[PDB]
Amino acid sequence: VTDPEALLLLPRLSIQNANAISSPLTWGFPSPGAFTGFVHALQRRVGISLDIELDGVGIVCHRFEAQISQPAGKRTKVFNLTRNPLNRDGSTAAIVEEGRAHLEVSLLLGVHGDGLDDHPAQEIARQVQEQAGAMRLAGGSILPWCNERFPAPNAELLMLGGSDEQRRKNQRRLTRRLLPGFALVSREALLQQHLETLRTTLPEATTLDALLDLCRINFEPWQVRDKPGWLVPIPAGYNALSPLYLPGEVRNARDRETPLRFVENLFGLGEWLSPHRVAALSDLLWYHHAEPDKGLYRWSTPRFV
Amino acid sequence: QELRQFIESFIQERLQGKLDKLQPDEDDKRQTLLATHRREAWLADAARRVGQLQLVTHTLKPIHPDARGSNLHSLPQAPGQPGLAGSHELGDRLVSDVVGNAAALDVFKFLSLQYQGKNLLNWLTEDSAEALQALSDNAEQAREWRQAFIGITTVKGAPASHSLAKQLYFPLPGSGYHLLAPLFPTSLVHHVHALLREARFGDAAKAAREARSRQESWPHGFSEYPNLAIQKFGGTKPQNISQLNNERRGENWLLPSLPPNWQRQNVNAPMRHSSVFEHDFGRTPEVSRLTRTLQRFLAKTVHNNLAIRQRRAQLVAQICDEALQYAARLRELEPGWSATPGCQLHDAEQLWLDPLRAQTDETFLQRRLRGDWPAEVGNRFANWLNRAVSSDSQILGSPEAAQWSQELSKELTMFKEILEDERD
Amino acid sequence: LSTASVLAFERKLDPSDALMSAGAWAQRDASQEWPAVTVREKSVRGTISNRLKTKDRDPAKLDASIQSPNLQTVDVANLPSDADTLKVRFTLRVLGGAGTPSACNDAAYRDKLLQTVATYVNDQGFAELARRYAHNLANARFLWRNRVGAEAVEVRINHIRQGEVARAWRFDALAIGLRDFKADAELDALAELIASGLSGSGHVLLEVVAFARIGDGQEVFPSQELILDKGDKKGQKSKTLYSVRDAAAIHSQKIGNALRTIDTWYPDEDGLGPIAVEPYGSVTSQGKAYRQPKQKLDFYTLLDNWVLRDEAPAVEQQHYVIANLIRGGVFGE
Amino acid sequence: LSTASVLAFERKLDPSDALMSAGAWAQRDASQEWPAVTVREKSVRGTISNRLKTKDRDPAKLDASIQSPNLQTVDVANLPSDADTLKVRFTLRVLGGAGTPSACNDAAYRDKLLQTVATYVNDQGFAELARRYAHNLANARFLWRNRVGAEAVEVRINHIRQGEVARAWRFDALAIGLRDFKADAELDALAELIASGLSGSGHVLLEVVAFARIGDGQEVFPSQELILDKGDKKGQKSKTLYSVRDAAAIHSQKIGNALRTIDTWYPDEDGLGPIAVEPYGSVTSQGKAYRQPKQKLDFYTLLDNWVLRDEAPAVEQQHYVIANLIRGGVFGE
DNA sequence: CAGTCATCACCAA
């Protein structure tokens, strides 16, 4: 909601062994729920000793590879597993399947606090990076440096105090540091828009998302067409099955302080657009916003349109 | 009351199915007890083993091996925003899986065969007039069946969770946190799994593929799902999980959601006699679809022109950013860019998409591209991209030549200003 | 007081994936630019050499199929014919806060546990377990089959705190045995650093490089990933090796499993070498679980007696109980 | 007591792949810079020279296919016309510890197996096995089709400790035969080195160099690649010869086959030459299997009698069982 | 005489 003044680039985050299932109906790149949980986990450890805030994340995703294998006679995939230790009788344990992938990621944060005028912003950049290099980005660890120990420091720059001409040179200087990536935004208006193509059939909604991430072909009145983006099904929050429980009610909870619901996933849509296609970089940022009483929990990116 | 033969085929069918279980050493009580209690005590076994299970729509057995907890049983509500729908706005053709005791899910088939043939699946618990005439039991037996058959759809145990569950935190707008414990949508994954098994294979989705194979097809829609992934639940035995067997077999099919740029090639722009000068176009493997789209979307007229006039406005950026990504993932992304072999022609590509100076950096290395006008790659780019936006005598003489060359001019205008600030 | 129904410990001693690269010995001081060992595919003709099943005893098929061949497709990773030295490089983050769980139900159980851990720390710090972590760094145990038959092994460890090096160690890993934690002042200066990182006090980030002279063009052994039920067509691929980008590699969990071979104190037969730290302390190659709860020295029994009942075990079992907290786990009711 | 359901034995006697180069005699002791024999693809006009099916034998096509030519594309390697000598160079590690499995399920069976192998070792070493491997190194068995009709063959073996060499042997590989195991005192000095490798007494790395005087421009025979699961059109390639980077080569498993042709102890025709060490003694290229399961001389009968039921075989079959354990494999039930 | 620990059949396209 609150537009930040300065954006914080976390330039290279080579992370290993992230989760790659992310919902019961998708696989591949992890959910942006992991990224906004990561930035509020930065908020509870750094942002109070700097008296700043950090709300939104610019998910860029330079590289991607998944620990998958192509079997014989199939065009599908399976996942490469770990070998778990034995049971107490010496026999072998069962198999729970955890997909796994390596990533390389850039990040764009948003500051809102009095520490930006109480400090140099280099203090904010150094402290946020040196603490975030001891955390887990999606489900896996954040790696230290290598041959790539030259892009290690950050950058940070405001947008309100300054001229209004060479800020194009400034944000396209920023774009020189995230140039091979594909940003990930929320494009859920097209899920509305592809019901009118099915309005001749029914006003149903659950099979509309399963129409866009594939190759639909009819014959000549072969029918291939340019898909209008890199449009992919992402998960987009939780919807309540069960009423809110008082913090001593549910057996085997993580906490004895917070209240608990039983929820399940809701599915949206995204696109892997290059950052050139959007003018202002503050459009990309992902935010948590969810109303508590009726149980709809959701994350999206505002300011995209 | 001609609906007791289902009870006959449930009792005597299983009793005759135990004909391969022949042990001539110690069956002298097992065979007699099986013949006796397989019929009469089968109602007792289906009463005592009718209370180990429950109906579900939020199972947790499919998220951990032995996570003994409480499974949900009600559908989620409607999401109040526009543009995102899931396991609550699904249709009224839902199917509740039956999680419970793995060695007790055989009486569930005899209890749920009443939704096959007749319409008396809702006659066993309530409306036992469809369970008095062909049941052939007394008041104690009819009451015991109507009591034991209510423990499926109702609650089985206490509402709880487990240590192997997820239970995420969510920040509230101006408050603390709620714990969100997500569940596995067994009903939704059954619906999408049956939906995709008729879309990847089946009658029409494969007969249209043979119609393509006979090269004579009229328009009819088939579907193709490339690069999925498979996940197994349970393992060698998936019947310990809820049903997962009717046509699931522990194989929920996962749709791909990958990033675009995670399967790249290698950057080889060396000092070659054509790998320096002939590499002024950006010959990549992912531009064939864009060239084919710009070709095959140029023949339609403006008789349906309320949608096709909003795609070439983004294609200039969608082809210029490809050259930007190539020149910034090959030159700077590669660790080297040497002098061109046959430098009288292989030097302009080393000027435009080239890295910084190196160990062969003499005096005149940071004094040519640091002061030379970096605006010569505009006309060559317009000639290259204007070869895929080809001119025609029926295109230049028509009113589409200016309306398709203005886009190439507006694309070539800004790329020189973008790439004229790296050195100069 | 009851045991907490949700316990979960974040791991410490977090390693990366190893990377393999080939070069020559005494050219190993300029080894920042050796080329990476790639995974090569090959197909293989062989013989039926398994116990055939007489369950379906056929006097026609199972005797002639002994005579007929067996065609398979595997992976392999070799050194080049002009390289005799294998280089393996990874990094190791040590975190600290080695007694604080990531999820606990009651804060009273948390208060009963955290002062027990601090009572363990103040009288005898993490130095005595950091010695045995620093040993398994110093002798190159993470080279699993790559040490077997190697002639000279050298392990280099660099403490990095900034852009560049702070402190550097050199070792001869074959002079340091796999069974005998004989401490010496070359690595007690490493053990104090790993202990001061496990406390939570100072920064620690190691860079571990291991050299192993093997032979010209020999076969090195990167990690093989479990692929359960792949290739129902018989034109399949049996062995599949693990590769990070254009390099042979070892999984991170295998390197961590090599680093936490600490347990010498197990009560079945202690004179057989240190095993990996596990609850119900077991070993998958041996096919057997040492440290069985009938002989009440596993992790659940000792943790409950030492937190809930204050029955302190011996110091040697306490090192095991703390090593399961550096290892981390997921516990329940 | 049963055998374990999982057994894995690592290979001992692990060779690399061999690479081919060419030159002339009297330069064979300055042969370090010979150029490699290269792989060349050629195209062949030939003749239909197979049997003809009578199941759809239409004489319009079948009687007319004979008269018309046959076009095939193959691969061939030759010596240069300047040179007359093949050179083959590979390395060989001898590991030791050849009775201890690397994966098991039982512990009692593991101790029974280790004390059985120690019973074998501490009354007779590996010397009968080591001199048979030294025979197969001393003649040039590993040159498979290349030595056939070769005029003179010389085999040089070097023992390597560092950059410098420690011990050197030279031989006449045509005086030593393929069916005898008659030796001299010079081969026993190699047999004791291999037997000190197999018993873990020392580190053994060997460099085996074989020269074969064949002829000017004659054809050499590298190993042929098994190309599996193609599904292609009319044979775009029908013979692909194995090479490494710009050098023709032999697979490591074919040299490994040639070194372990040790078995002269098989029942029917033990006077008719040694065969390789397999569990079921099968020679696949000759289409039969010595050591059937019916005559109780295969590995899965003798192993189970000798380890479990204390039924020690004859010594000549004990050599077969220990050779199968130097080999390796999956010997589980 | 009552908790608890290893085993035991129960299912299952």
Side-chain angles (χ1 to χ4, degrees), chain A residues 1-198 203 205 207-217 220-305, chain B residues 17 24 35 41 44 46-47 51 62 65 67 69 76 78-80 82-83 85-86 91 100 102-104 117 129 131 134 139 142 148 151 157-254 256 259-260 269-270 282 285 299 307 313 317 323 327-328 335-336 339 341-342 348 355 358 371 374-375 378 382 388 397 399 401-402, chain C residues 1-267 271-333, chain D residues 1-55 59-267 271-333:
Chain A
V1 175
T2 303
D3 187 73
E5 296 89 355
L7 301 180
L8 185 60
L9 174 62
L10 270 292
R12 303 289 179 88
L13 272 299
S14 178
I15 65 102
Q16 65 176 358
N17 297 318
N19 196 0
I21 301 298
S22 302
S23 72
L25 297 179
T26 319
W27 69 275
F29 189 78
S31 178
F35 292 91
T36 179
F38 179 73
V39 73
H40 200 77
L42 280 168
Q43 272 296 110
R44 292 186 312 277
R45 199 175 297 170
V46 178
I48 53 173
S49 67
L50 291 175
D51 294 335
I52 62 169
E53 289 86 6
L54 292 171
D55 55 349
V57 174
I59 301 167
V60 178
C61 185
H62 303 286
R63 298 291 94 185
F64 181 77
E65 69 273 16
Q67 295 181 358
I68 54 170
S69 71
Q70 178 66 49
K74 299 182 178 69
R75 288 289 189 268
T76 182
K77 303 292 187 292
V78 297
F79 294 100
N80 304 131
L81 272 303
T82 57
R83 191 174 182 181
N84 308 121
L86 298 173
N87 290 317
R88 59 181 286 271
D89 57 350
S91 176
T92 64
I95 300 300
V96 290
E97 285 79 358
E98 293 180 350
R100 187 169 290 111
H102 288 179
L103 295 176
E104 188 175 1
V105 168
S106 294
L107 300 176
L108 293 175
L109 300 181
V111 305
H112 296 87
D114 203 2
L116 184 58
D117 292 337
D118 287 332
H119 292 280
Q122 186 67 40
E123 177 67 28
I124 291 174
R126 289 182 66 249
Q127 182 174 358
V128 165
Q129 193 183 10
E130 287 177 354
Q131 194 271 320
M135 296 172 69
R136 292 190 180 183
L137 189 67
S141 69
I142 294 171
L143 290 175
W145 298 101
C146 181
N147 299 114
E148 301 92 7
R149 65 180 67 189
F150 291 159
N154 307 115
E156 187 176 2
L157 77 164
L158 277 75
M159 290 295 288
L160 182 65
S163 68
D164 290 329
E165 190 271 335
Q166 54 88 30
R167 289 183 292 114
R168 293 190 181 183
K169 292 182 180 181
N170 293 322
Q171 68 179 354
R172 275 84 171 95
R173 184 179 64 86
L174 289 179
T175 306
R176 289 184 180 93
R177 293 181 65 185
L178 47 85
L179 55 85
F182 290 159
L184 178 68
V185 299
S186 178
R187 193 72 266 274
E188 73 271 14
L190 294 175
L191 191 64
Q192 297 174 355
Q193 191 70 37
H194 286 281
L195 200 145
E196 287 81 3
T197 63
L198 278 305
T207 187
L208 272 60
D209 183 71
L211 190 144
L212 195 58
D213 59 343
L214 66 150
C215 187
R216 300 283 177 179
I217 291 173
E220 300 181 356
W222 61 272
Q223 289 288 317
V224 69
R225 65 177 294 276
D226 288 332
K227 180 166 68 178
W230 286 101
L231 299 168
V232 291
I234 66 170
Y238 294 97
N239 195 2
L241 279 76
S242 181
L244 188 65
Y245 288 104
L246 273 301
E249 297 294 327
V250 171
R251 182 176 291 113
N252 301 326
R254 282 175 64 182
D255 193 1
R256 295 183 183 270
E257 199 275 329
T258 56
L260 187 144
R261 288 183 185 271
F262 291 100
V263 294
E264 76 182 6
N265 293 111
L266 294 179
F267 302 99
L269 193 145
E271 56 181 353
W272 292 98
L273 55 87
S274 179
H276 290 284
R277 292 187 178 98
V278 173
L281 292 174
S282 176
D283 294 331
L284 302 175
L285 277 70
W286 288 83
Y287 290 151
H288 266 167
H289 45 278
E291 49 91 14
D293 288 330
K294 185 170 87 273
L296 191 276
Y297 297 96
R298 189 263 301 275
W299 55 85
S300 66
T301 178
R303 294 191 295 268
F304 176 71
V305 316
Chain B
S161 178
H162 194 268
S163 177
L164 272 300
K166 299 300 179 184
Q167 305 171 359
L168 286 75
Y169 284 96
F170 202 93
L172 287 179
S175 180
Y177 298 95
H178 295 296
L179 280 174
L180 303 178
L183 297 169
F184 185 77
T186 302
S187 301
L188 184 68
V189 72
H190 179 76
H191 182 74
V192 70
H193 202 268
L195 191 275
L196 200 147
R197 74 171 70 256
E198 59 91 17
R200 192 176 70 240
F201 62 97
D203 193 8
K206 293 292 181 72
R209 295 181 70 250
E210 281 110 12
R212 289 183 59 85
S213 178
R214 268 69 169 177
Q215 285 74 239
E216 50 90 26
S217 180
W218 59 92
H220 191 199
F222 74 101
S223 298
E224 181 68 32
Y225 293 97
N227 61 15
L228 297 180
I230 315 297
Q231 187 182 4
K232 280 89 175 67
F233 288 155
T236 59
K237 289 188 181 293
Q239 76 271 18
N240 290 314
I241 314 299
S242 65
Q243 282 295 107
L244 201 69
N245 287 316
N246 196 357
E247 207 176 2
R248 274 88 61 86
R249 299 185 71 184
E251 287 185 355
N252 52 350
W253 296 337
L254 296 174
Chain C
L1 183 66
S2 67
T3 182
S5 179
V6 170
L7 287 174
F9 292 93
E10 170 68 28
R11 83 169 77 93
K12 274 74 185 170
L13 302 174
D14 194 358
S16 68
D17 285 331
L19 276 78
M20 289 179 176
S21 67
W25 192 264
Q27 298 287 324
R28 67 190 188 274
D29 298 331
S31 65
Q32 299 91 19
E33 59 270 16
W34 288 359
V37 173
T38 183
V39 173
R40 188 176 66 247
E41 194 81 36
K42 71 178 185 180
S43 295
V44 159
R45 185 179 178 181
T47 59
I48 301 295
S49 66
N50 55 2
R51 296 183 190 271
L52 52 88
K53 273 75 178 171
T54 60
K55 295 178 180 179
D56 295 331
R57 179 76 274 278
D58 195 1
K61 185 259 292 181
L62 290 173
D63 54 355
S65 179
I66 298 169
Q67 299 174 355
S68 297
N70 192 0
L71 303 176
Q72 300 296 326
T73 299
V74 303
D75 291 341
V76 68
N78 294 110
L79 298 175
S81 68
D82 53 352
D84 57 349
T85 303
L86 177 67
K87 180 185 175 183
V88 165
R89 181 182 180 273
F90 69 99
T91 61
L92 181 63
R93 290 193 292 116
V94 186
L95 270 302
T100 58
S102 69
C104 185
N105 289 114
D106 196 2
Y109 182 80
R110 187 181 296 116
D111 288 331
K112 190 68 178 67
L113 177 62
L114 265 65
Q115 67 174 355
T116 301
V117 177
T119 302
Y120 175 75
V121 169
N122 62 4
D123 58 352
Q124 47 185 357
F126 293 105
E128 204 275 336
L129 287 176
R131 285 173 62 250
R132 288 191 289 270
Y133 286 146
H135 280 88
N136 289 321
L137 285 177
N139 59 5
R141 189 192 291 272
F142 54 89
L143 296 172
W144 279 92
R145 194 175 172 179
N146 299 313
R147 287 184 79 247
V148 178
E151 191 174 8
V153 184
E154 181 178 359
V155 179
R156 297 178 182 180
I157 299 168
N158 292 324
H159 172 61
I160 294 172
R161 193 173 293 182
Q162 283 293 111
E164 290 180 354
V165 181
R167 174 66 170 86
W169 290 274
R170 295 172 65 87
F171 290 105
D172 193 2
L174 293 179
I176 300 169
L178 295 175
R179 294 184 183 180
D180 296 327
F181 296 104
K182 300 283 101 179
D184 52 359
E186 57 177 358
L187 58 86
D188 288 336
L190 182 62
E192 60 87 19
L193 180 59
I194 299 172
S196 70
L198 286 169
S199 68
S201 299
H203 185 271
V204 51
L205 176 62
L206 303 171
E207 181 185 2
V208 179
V209 178
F211 294 99
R213 169 177 274 174
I214 295 170
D216 294 332
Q218 291 293 324
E219 181 180 1
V220 304
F221 301 102
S223 181
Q224 178 181 358
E225 62 269 20
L226 195 154
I227 310 171
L228 187 60
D229 198 0
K230 185 181 77 176
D232 291 333
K233 182 171 72 69
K234 287 184 179 180
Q236 59 184 353
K237 178 169 69 175
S238 65
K239 184 167 77 171
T240 308
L241 295 177
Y242 176 74
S243 67
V244 300
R245 297 178 65 187
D246 198 72
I250 302 169
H251 291 98
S252 65
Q253 66 269 20
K254 180 170 280 290
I255 301 166
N257 194 9
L259 292 179
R260 57 184 164 86
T261 59
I262 306 301
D263 194 4
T264 60
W265 311 283
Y266 55 94
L272 276 303
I275 62 168
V277 177
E278 289 289 330
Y280 307 108
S282 67
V283 42
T284 65
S285 65
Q286 194 73 39
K288 183 258 191 292
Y290 302 101
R291 193 185 286 270
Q292 201 70 255
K294 293 291 184 180
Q295 293 80 19
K296 284 83 177 174
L297 290 174
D298 57 349
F299 178 68
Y300 290 159
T301 299
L302 294 174
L303 181 65
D304 292 332
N305 286 115
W306 188 44
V307 175
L308 300 175
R309 275 78 58 87
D310 202 74
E311 181 181 0
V315 55
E316 306 298 328
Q317 300 294 325
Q318 290 175 358
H319 293 294
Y320 170 73
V321 172
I322 298 298
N324 279 313
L325 303 180
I326 282 97
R327 179 187 180 272
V330 169
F331 298 137
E333 183 179 359
Chain D
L1 179 62
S2 176
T3 59
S5 64
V6 168
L7 282 174
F9 289 91
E10 295 174 354
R11 72 173 71 89
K12 277 77 185 172
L13 280 302
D14 197 1
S16 66
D17 55 348
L19 276 72
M20 290 179 178
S21 65
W25 277 69
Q27 290 87 17
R28 70 191 188 277
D29 52 356
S31 64
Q32 288 76 241
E33 289 85 3
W34 282 358
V37 172
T38 184
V39 159
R40 180 177 65 83
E41 175 179 359
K42 76 177 184 180
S43 298
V44 166
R45 184 179 180 178
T47 308
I48 298 297
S49 66
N50 55 358
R51 292 180 182 267
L52 299 177
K53 62 181 176 64
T54 185
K55 280 77 177 172
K61 65 178 178 68
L62 194 67
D63 203 4
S65 69
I66 302 167
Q67 299 172 354
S68 297
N70 190 0
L71 303 181
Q72 303 299 321
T73 299
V74 296
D75 190 81
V76 65
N78 297 111
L79 294 171
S81 299
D82 185 76
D84 58 350
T85 312
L86 182 62
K87 177 184 175 180
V88 164
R89 178 182 180 273
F90 68 99
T91 60
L92 180 63
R93 284 194 291 121
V94 183
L95 274 309
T100 63
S102 67
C104 192
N105 289 326
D106 196 358
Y109 176 73
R110 177 167 174 169
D111 284 331
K112 188 67 174 66
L113 178 59
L114 265 70
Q115 70 98 32
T116 300
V117 173
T119 301
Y120 181 81
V121 172
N122 293 117
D123 57 353
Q124 55 189 357
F126 295 98
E128 180 62 33
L129 297 173
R131 69 179 63 193
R132 286 170 179 258
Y133 295 123
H135 281 90
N136 283 324
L137 284 172
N139 62 7
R141 185 72 66 96
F142 56 90
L143 301 175
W144 279 88
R145 193 179 171 183
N146 293 318
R147 65 172 286 160
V148 178
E151 181 174 355
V153 184
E154 183 180 3
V155 173
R156 293 181 180 176
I157 301 169
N158 289 317
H159 174 69
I160 293 169
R161 291 295 93 206
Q162 281 87 16
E164 63 269 14
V165 67
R167 178 68 171 86
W169 292 273
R170 286 172 177 85
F171 291 101
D172 191 1
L174 290 178
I176 303 167
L178 272 70
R179 195 169 298 117
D180 291 331
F181 286 102
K182 282 91 172 66
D184 59 347
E186 186 69 28
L187 191 148
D188 294 334
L190 182 66
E192 58 88 20
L193 186 70
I194 297 171
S196 69
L198 286 171
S199 66
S201 297
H203 181 268
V204 174
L205 176 63
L206 300 176
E207 179 181 359
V208 178
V209 175
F211 296 103
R213 180 181 286 170
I214 296 170
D216 286 331
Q218 289 292 322
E219 182 176 359
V220 298
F221 300 99
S223 186
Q224 180 176 356
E225 288 180 353
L226 172 60
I227 304 300
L228 187 62
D229 190 74
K230 290 180 259 72
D232 57 350
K233 204 174 262 76
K234 52 180 76 174
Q236 283 74 241
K237 289 293 291 295
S238 65
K239 182 165 76 172
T240 303
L241 295 179
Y242 178 70
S243 71
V244 192
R245 289 176 287 111
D246 67 11
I250 305 166
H251 295 106
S252 68
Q253 66 271 21
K254 196 175 185 182
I255 295 172
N257 188 19
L259 295 183
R260 64 184 173 89
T261 58
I262 300 303
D263 194 4
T264 55
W265 306 286
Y266 56 95
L272 271 293
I275 60 171
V277 179
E278 294 98 2
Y280 292 105
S282 66
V283 285
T284 298
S285 66
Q286 296 181 357
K288 70 185 291 184
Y290 309 101
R291 301 176 189 271
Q292 295 288 322
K294 294 188 266 79
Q295 297 90 22
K296 276 78 178 174
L297 276 306
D298 51 353
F299 175 70
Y300 291 150
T301 300
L302 296 178
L303 181 66
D304 292 333
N305 293 323
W306 178 38
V307 175
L308 300 180
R309 287 179 294 271
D310 294 332
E311 299 172 354
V315 179
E316 286 86 6
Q317 306 298 316
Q318 292 181 357
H319 296 294
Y320 172 71
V321 176
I322 301 300
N324 278 310
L325 295 178
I326 269 97
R327 174 186 173 271
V330 181
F331 310 116
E333 54 89 19

